[PDB]
């Protein structure tokens, strides 16, 4: 038939502060935001939501009896979804760590921090700009999005994109005007 519209359902939780201004909470959150190079606490809230919901599914399987049909079958999916992304390292595959986890693992696997880790940026603030500057990509098709969430598979592939300098052909506008003035104008 003719279809309906779009629901959505919450992407984030800002529910976590019991008290809106807590000095301890503010200090801790801002440090994470600084190190990984998020701009906003909104970006923290969405990843916090992702952590909680993924963990919530895991709790249900483990509390139930061993060799319960849901536990074994769904447990295969539970293990691999995290592992594929690189969220869950091998060796931590006890299923105890899936319950535990950390906020940090998600941010670590994002593209933005990977740029800085592999030299290049000389600031995590600079790493945020670099993706917008069209530098670095898995394939050919530019990522300007810091939250790309690299698989570890696609980590290997990260090198400059086909466009922009260091990648090849075009330098961009600032040099183009400077060289034009230099060769006809004398600057």
């Amino acid at each position: 038939m003719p279809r309906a519209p779009r629901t959505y359902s919450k992407t984030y939780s800002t529910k976590k502060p019991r008290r809106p201004y807590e000095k301890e909470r503010l200090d801790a959150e801002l440090k994470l935001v600084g190190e990984y190079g998020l701009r906003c606490k909104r970006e923290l809230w969405r990843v916090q939501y992702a952590l909680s919901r993924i963990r919530n599914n895991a709790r249900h399987l483990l509390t139930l009896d061993e060799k319960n049909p849901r536990r074994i079958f769904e447990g295969e999916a539970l293990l691999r979804r995290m592992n594929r992304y690189g969220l869950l390292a091998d060796g931590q595959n006890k299923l105890d760590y899936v319950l535990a986890l950390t906020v940090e693992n998600f941010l670590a696997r994002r593209l933005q921090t990977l740029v800085f880790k592999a030299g290049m940026a000389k600031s995590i603030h600079h790493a945020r700009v670099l993706i917008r500057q069209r530098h670095i990509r898995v394939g050919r098709q530019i990522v300007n999005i810091p939250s790309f969430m690299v698989r570890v598979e696609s980590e290997k592939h990260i090198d400059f994109s086909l466009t922009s300098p260091f990648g090849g052909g075009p330098p961009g506008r600032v040099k183009r005007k400077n060289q034009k003035k230099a060769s006809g104008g004398g600057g």
Binding site: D27, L30, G34
Partner: peptide, 22 residues
């Protein structure tokens, strides 16, 4: 976005003041 960037660097590196709390 830009103003937000500043805040963490100001408070945690060389700090600001810290009589009582901050």
């Amino acid at each position: 976005r830009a103003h937000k960037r500043m805040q963490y660097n100001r408070r945690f590196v060389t700090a600001v003041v810290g009589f009582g709390k901050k």
